[PDB]
T-cell receptor, first 222, second 195 residues
Framework: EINQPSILVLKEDENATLSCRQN?????MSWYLQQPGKGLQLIYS???????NKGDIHTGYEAKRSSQEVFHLDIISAKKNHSAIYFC????????????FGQGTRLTVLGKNSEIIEPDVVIFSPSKQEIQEKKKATLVCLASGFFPDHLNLVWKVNGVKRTEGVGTDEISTSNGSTYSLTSRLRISAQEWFNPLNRFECIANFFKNGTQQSIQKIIYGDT | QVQQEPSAETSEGTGINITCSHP??????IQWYRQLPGRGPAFLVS?????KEVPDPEGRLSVSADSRSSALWLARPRLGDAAVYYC???????????FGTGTRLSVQPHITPSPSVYRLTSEDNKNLEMCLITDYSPEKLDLSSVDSKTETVVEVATSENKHEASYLSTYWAKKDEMQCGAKHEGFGILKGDDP
């Protein structure tokens, strides 16, 4: 249940707070930094309410354990060097006790000139030849045109989160000045040939200080 | 300080060893985590010495006699075990946990190839085409003439085989400037047509 923001985009020199919330009555909480090929590095930890400990890479950060449930990470004068995936973690106490991690916050620090561009989102009609030859339909959802590089793409089938048969690119493809991201949902022909089945690709991103989504739908055939 | 190989690869059902070396740290305790796509690191096993069985993913953790290294053995990796595996060591009961750089495990399902290529269109952007390459063998597919392609593996629930696995590659471009093809060992020239 440990909660932390999904995506955050900041401008240069901006201040911002990432707040982690846990419902396990854990005394230990912590904030970790993940950057490509730099493992997981402790930014700030807390052994209890209103107790904080600097990590090795704390320069540029402050933190406040406002209560047992909540541990704030403050970003001071946001810099390109801040861009990372941030993980909050908790445990009953420190010392050889498993840490419970959140799903992670992807933070991007932008130049005070660059704007955030929402993606264009299309679903491609599946190939009738593939359906005949392979008895399967591959639905390709493409998100393109967006900036910065981080964006989440998920599928829902008839209002329900779908993971079976989904392959989503882990990393965005740089196309000139913008990025794109692709997700494929491959389903059986029987599941495709139902005009009631609602196949929904959702792109979640961050724009204008808030989290936004674009939803694209394609229905099955008769 | 805590070193791991950046990546590892194995075929489904073929066990693989993931090492972790920390010569400058004589571990008081060793833990291993794995980070699945769209998730944060998740606890797998912890030990102070010797070898310890791992429930999920099935295998065994072995700590070196001098406690300056360990190894996570996955006995039966499946596609769902593809993740970034982290070791984390503690020099003392009371001191800091230090994480390794993480090893990105890739698990290749067994596949019977039947490479096919297809062109797709979308009603929302009619001046765009998507090239789909399916049911191929990754080491035999040639997509040399494209940099902007991406690849994945998915499982589909069919009649005869509860979950068959298949590779998929895609690349897209403005319709006019799109040429959907590939070359695949033992299948010659692959080219896409339309309805």
């Amino acid at each position: 249940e440990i909660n932390q923001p999904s995506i955050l985009v900041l401008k240069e020199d901006e201040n911002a707070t990432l707040s982690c919330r846990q419902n396990d009555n854990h005394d230990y909480m912590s904030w970790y930094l993940q950057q490509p090929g730099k493992g997981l590095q402790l930014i700030y930890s807390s052994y209890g309410v209103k107790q904080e400990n600097k990590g090795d890479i704390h320069t540029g950060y402050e933190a406040k354990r406002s209560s047992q449930e909540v541990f704030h990470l403050d970003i001071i004068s946001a810099k390109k060097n801040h861009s990372a995936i941030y993980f909050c973690a908790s445990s009953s106490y420190k010392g050889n006790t498993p840490l419970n991690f959140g799903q992670g916050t992807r933070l991007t620090v932008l130049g005070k000139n660059s704007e955030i561009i929402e993606p264009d989102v299309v679903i491609f009609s599946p190939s009738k030849q593939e359906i005949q030859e392979k008895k399967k339909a591959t639905l390709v959802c493409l998100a393109s045109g967006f900036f910065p590089d981080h964006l989440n793409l998920v599928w829902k089938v008839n209002g329900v989160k779908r993971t079976e048969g989904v392959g989503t690119d882990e990393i965005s493809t740089s196309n000139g000045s913008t990025y794109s991201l692709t997700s494929r949902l491959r389903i059986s022909a029987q599941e495709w040939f139902n005009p009631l089945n609602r196949f929904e690709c959702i792109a979640n991103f961050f724009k204008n200080g808030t989290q936004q989504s674009i939803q694209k739908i394609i229905y099955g055939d008769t | 300080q805590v070193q791991q190989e950046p990546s590892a690869e194995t075929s489904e059902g073929t066990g693989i060893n993931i090492t972790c070396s920390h010569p400058s740290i004589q571990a008081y305790s060793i833990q291993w985590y794995r980070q699945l796509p769209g998730r944060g690191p998740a606890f797998l096993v912890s030990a102070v010495k010797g070898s310890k069985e791992v429930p999920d993913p099935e295998g065994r953790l072995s700590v070196s006699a001098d406690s300056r290294s360990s190894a996570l053995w996955l006995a039966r990796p499946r596609l769902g075990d593809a993740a970034v595996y982290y070791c984390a060591v503690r020099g003392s009961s009371y001191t800091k946990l230090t994480f390794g750089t993480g090893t990105r495990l890739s698990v290749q399902p067994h596949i019977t190839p039947s490479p096919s290529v297809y062109r797709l269109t979308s009603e929302d952007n009619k001046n765009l085409e998507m090239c789909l390459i399916t049911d191929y063998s990754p080491e035999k597919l040639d997509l040399s003439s494209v940099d902007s392609k991406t690849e994945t593996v998915v499982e589909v629930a069919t009649s005869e085989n509860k979950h068959e696995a298949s590779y998929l590659s895609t690349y897209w471009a403005k319709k006019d400037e799109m040429q959907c093809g590939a070359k695949h060992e033992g299948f010659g020239i692959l080219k896409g047509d339309d309805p």
